[PDB]
Design a protein around this ligand. Structure first.
Ligand code: 4FS
Length: 167
């Protein structure tokens, strides 16, 4: 049993809810929250900006030190950093950004990072401002992630379309 409430069950391991991931993280304090990161860990907008704002910029300060030491992530890659006030850990995952011309085949590699964690609170990778089709992102999630994933969708209209269209 876990603390996640109000989710619709899509598969054995994938759950979905219309929710603000920031407000969900604050309530649950999950072991892992996933950030929709870029390779520079520059958290300016979208999920990254919303989570960073909720940490009072502490996520960005930590991230800048990580990049100064290690250099940029790979598209499809990840790193584990602090969850600050939101979670124990934040898994920063880089999905391909279609608005930068990145290979959408890298979305499966991105979701494979989730398999290193038994339970996660996450957004749909590459969806929203990353420019991918969220329906596609949910299909790749279900077909790639084997661990237990609780997906938060910010848009109510999109949530209803994701559920209604789910095969
Ligand atoms: N409170 C907010 C604001 N913006 C967001 C943008 C993308 C995903 C979630 C968000 C949550």
């Amino acid at each position: 049993v876990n603390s996640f409430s109000g989710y619709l069950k899509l598969t054995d391991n994938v759950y979905i809810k219309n929710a603000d991931i920031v407000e969900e993280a604050k309530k649950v304090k999950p072991t892992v929250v996933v950030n929709a990161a870029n390779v520079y860990l520059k958290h300016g907008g979208g999920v990254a900006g919303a989570l960073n704002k909720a940490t009072n910029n502490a996520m960005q300060v930590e991230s800048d030190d990580y990049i100064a030491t290690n250099g940029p992530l790979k598209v499809g890659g990840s790193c584990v950093l602090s969850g600050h006030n939101l979670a124990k850990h934040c898994l920063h995952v880089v999905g391909p950004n279609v608005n930068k011309g990145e290979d959408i085949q890298l979305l499966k590699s991105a979701y494979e990072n989730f398999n290193q964690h038994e339970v996660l609170l996450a957004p749909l990778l590459s969806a929203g401002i990353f420019g991918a089709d969220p329906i596609h992102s949910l299909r790749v999630c279900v077909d790639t992630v084997r661990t237990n994933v609780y997906l938060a969708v910010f848009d109510k209209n999109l949530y209803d379309k994701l559920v209604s269209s789910f095969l």
